[PDB]
């Protein structure tokens, strides 16, 4: 934040400091949370037919 100063009405102008605003920057990562499975069609239709 820009701090304030103080001068008498008939005092010097005396420029003071300003705040800082900055560019915060995150990024959606290149990296996936992933999970892949290879399932044969034989497993898919054999379990389906003979699934307890």
């Amino acid at each position: 934040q820009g701090v304030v100063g103080g001068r008498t009405r008939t005092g010097a102008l005396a420029n003071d400091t300003q705040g800082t605003i900055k560019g915060a920057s995150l990024s959606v990562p290149d990296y996936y949370i992933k999970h892949q499975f290879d399932v044969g069609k034989d497993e898919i239709v054999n379990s389906d037919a003979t699934g307890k």
Binding site: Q1, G2, V3, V4, G6, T8, Q18, I21
Partner: protein, 52 residues
């Protein structure tokens, strides 16, 4: 962002929300002296007093 698309606007807003902040702060502790600490105002600790 809208803050940087108007640095004067946010400079007024920043100084003008910390003006109120410094004004609030000095209403408590401001010994009345017209300096860079007590800012001329008498507040309460110079109005009433610090100790018994």
């Amino acid at each position: 962002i809208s803050a940087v698309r108007d640095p004067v606007g946010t400079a007024i807003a920043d100084a003008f929300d910390v003006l109120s902040k410094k004004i609030n702060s000095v209403l408590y502790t401001a010994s009345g002296v017209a300096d860079a600490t007590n800012y001329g105002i008498f507040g309460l600790d110079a109005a009433a007093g610090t100790t018994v």
